[PDB]
C-alpha cells in the first residue's frame, strides 16, 4: 500500500513499489494507453480540423516541479484549446514529459514501431459549461508531441531546460524564466497532421477518460537538451538514481481504431 514506479526504477528505490505490469486501479483493463499507431491503418476523418489555441502566445512564469515521476509545469487553466474534432473547449492543466537517454526508447507512443527520444504531454480537462447532463471517455484531452534530436538548440525550450538545474530531487519546485506554451510548439503547418483515439492516463490510476492526440511530426531539441533531462533530474532525493525511462510499456489496441486528420 504505497508508491508506484516505472520498470527501471524498481531495483534502485528503497520504498517498495508496484511495477507497470503490477499497477492497480484501472491499469489492467482494455482501453489503455499508450499504443503503437500503424499510420497506414488509421482512416482519414474529415471533422478532424485545425486546433485553435487561446493563451498559448502569452508570456508567463511557469511553476515547474520534479514530482518524482516526471518534470511537470503547472498551467493553472491559463491556456485553452478548441477545434481538433473536440466536443468543447479544454483548459490547460499541466505539461510534462517522458524520456530516455537513448534516441530509440524515450517515447510512450510509437509510430509504425518507431519510438522517439522523448514525449511531451500537455494535459487539458473538458470545459464545465453551465449545463451538465446526468465514466467520461473524453474528460481529459492530451496533446502529445514526439521529440527527436535535431542539430540546433530549440531556444523555445531553454527556460524549461535551465530550470532543470533547480529541481533535481523529487518534491522540489521552481519558477521558469518568462516563456509561452507557443515557444515549445512547432509552427502551425507541423500541427495540421495528427492521430486520434480514446484511451487512458499512462500513469496510475490509468483512468480511461482520455481523448488522445498524437501529432505526426516530431519536435526537435538539441541532443544536449534531451540529455539534460536524464543528467539533472533524479528519481531519488539522494541523487544517485537518474530520472530516465519514465515510460509505460505499450498497451494493446483491442477493439479500438485510430483515426487521423
Q: Which residues bind ligand 6CC (CB under 6 A)?
A: 67, 69-70, 121, 123, 140, 142, 201-203, 210
- Residue 140 or 258: the one with the smaller Cβ distance to ligand 6CC is 140
Report the relative pairing of strands 210-215 and 140-150 from DSSP bridges: parallel
CB of 40 to ligand 6CC, least distance (A): 25
Residue 126 in the binding site for Zn ion (CB under 5 A): no
| 109 known member of a binding site | no
Q: How far is the CB of 69 from ligand 6CC (least distance, A)?
A: 4
Question: Cβ 59 to Zn ion, closest distance in Å?
Answer: 25
Which of 152, 231, 208, 259 minimizes the C-alpha distance to 28? Answer: 208
Q: 40: burial class by Cβ within 10 Å (0-12, 13-18, 19+)?
A: exposed
Cα–Cα distance measured from residue 161 to residue 95, given in angstroms and rounded to the nearest whole number: 14
Residue 67 contact among ligand 6CC, Zn ion, none, beta carbon within 5 to 8 Å by kind: ligand 6CC
Active-site residue, selected from the candidate residues 69, 109, 115, 124: 69
8 A C-beta contact, residue 73 and residue 187: no
Q: How far apart are CA 141 and CA 125, in angstroms?
A: 6
70: which 3 cell numbers?
516526471
Q: Is 115 annotated for ligand binding?
A: no
Question: Which of ligand 6CC, Zn ion, none does residue 69 bind to, with CB < 5 to 8 Å depending on kind?
Answer: ligand 6CC
Cell of 150: 535535431
Q: Which spans in the chain are helix H?
A: 158-163, 223-232
The answer on whether 96 is annotated among ligand-binding residues is yes
69 in active site: yes
Q: Is 98 annotated as a binding residue?
A: yes
Query: Residues within the annotated binding site for substrate?
Result: 202-203
Active site members: 69
Amino acid at each position: 500500500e504505497s508508491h508506484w514506479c516505472y520498470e527501471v526504477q524498481a531495483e534502485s528505490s528503497n520504498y517498495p513499489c508496484l511495477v507497470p505490469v503490477k499497477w492497480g486501479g484501472n491499469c489492467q483493463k482494455d482501453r489503455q494507453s499508450p499504443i503503437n499507431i500503424v499510420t497506414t491503418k488509421a482512416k482519414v476523418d474529415k471533422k478532424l480540423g485545425r486546433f485553435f489555441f487561446s493563451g498559448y502566445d502569452k508570456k508567463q512564469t511557469w511553476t515547474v516541479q520534479n514530482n518524482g515521476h516526471s518534470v511537470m509545469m503547472l498551467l493553472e487553466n491559463k491556456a485553452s484549446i478548441s477545434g481538433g474534432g473536440l466536443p468543447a473547449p479544454y483548459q490547460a492543466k499541466q505539461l510534462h514529459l517522458h524520456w530516455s537517454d537513448l534516441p530509440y526508447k524515450g517515447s510512450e507512443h510509437s509510430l509504425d514501431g518507431e519510438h522517439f527520444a522523448m514525449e511531451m504531454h500537455i494535459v487539458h480537462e473538458k470545459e464545465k459549461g453551465t449545463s451538465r447532463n446526468v465514466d467520461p471517455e473524453d474528460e481529459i484531452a492530451v496533446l502529445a508531441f514526439l521529440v527527436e534530436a535535431g542539430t540546433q538548440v530549440n531556444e523555445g525550450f531553454q527556460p524549461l531546460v535551465e530550470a532543470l538545474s533547480n529541481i533535481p530531487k523529487p518534491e522540489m519546485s521552481t519558477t521558469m524564466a518568462e516563456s509561452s506554451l507557443l515557444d515549445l510548439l512547432p509552427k502551425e503547418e507541423k500541427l495540421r497532421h495528427y492521430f486520434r483515439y480514446l484511451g487512458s492516463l499512462t500513469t496510475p490510476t490509468c483512468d480511461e477518460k482520455v481523448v488522445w492526440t498524437v501529432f505526426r511530426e516530431p519536435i526537435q531539441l538539441h541532443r544536449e537538451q534531451i540529455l539534460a533531462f536524464s543528467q539533472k533530474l533524479y528519481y531519488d532525493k539522494e541523487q544517485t538514481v537518474s530520472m530516465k525511462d519514465n515510460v509505460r510499456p505499450l498497451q494493446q489496441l483491442g477493439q479500438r481504431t485510430v483515426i487521423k486528420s
